[PDB]
């Protein structure tokens, strides 16, 4: 478990995914997407089986956030290769991405560029839909540690004001 967590942390972070998804071809991107789908499905099942609760909560959420940042960054570039690659990779990985609803909203906003029409644009549209259709995601299980609890309290106060 120790060495496994260390290896996965060295792979996820260090900013390798972003360029390695630029370099490879289409089918190579599909394959790497399948690999990430498998590893994340197994990790999430391990988490939801309660086995990892001590500190794996914070580290797992950090991994999810770093992967979300990397994809949101690479998905925004002018080239054609990066766009087609990101589209294929997400078309593979989006099947299991029950992260915080904030993350799904962030990916939906980043994919909602809708620039001049093309083939990439036609492909991006079904990849902006069929992922917002999740709309079932958990956000409380993450943590309350940081001052973010105060921001949640302020948002709750704003919602209470709205209720009137």
């Amino acid at each position: 478990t120790e060495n496994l967590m260390s290896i996965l942390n060295t792979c996820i972070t260090s900013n390798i995914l972003k360029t390695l998804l630029f370099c490879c071809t289409s089918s190579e991107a599909g394959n790497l997407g399948l690999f990430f789908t498998d590893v994340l499905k197994k990790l999430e099942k391990m988490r939801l089986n309660g086995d990892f609760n001590d500190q794996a909560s914070r580290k797992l959420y950090e991994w999810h956030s770093v992967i979300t940042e990397q994809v949101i960054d690479l998905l925004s570039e002018k080239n054609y290769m990066s766009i087609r690659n990101g589209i294929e990779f997400m078309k593979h990985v989006t099947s299991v991405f029950p992260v915080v609803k904030a993350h799904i909203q962030l990916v939906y906003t980043t994919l909602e560029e809708n620039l001049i029409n093309e083939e990439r644009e036609d492909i991006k549209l079904p990849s902006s839909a069929l992922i917002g259709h999740l709309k079932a995601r958990l956000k409380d299980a993450l943590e309350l540690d940081e001052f973010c609890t105060l921001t949640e309290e302020e948002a709750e106060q704003k919602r209470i004001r709205e209720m009137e």
Binding site: S14, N15, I16, K18, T19, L20, F22, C23, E77, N79, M81, S82
Partner: peptide, 28 residues
Amino acid sequence: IRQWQTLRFLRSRYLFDFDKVNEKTGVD
């Protein structure tokens, strides 16, 4: 395209020295 070819060729030797690319000329 030149960056694409150089990257395809360097994927085996020095993978972890890839953060420097960042949609720009190969940072040596």
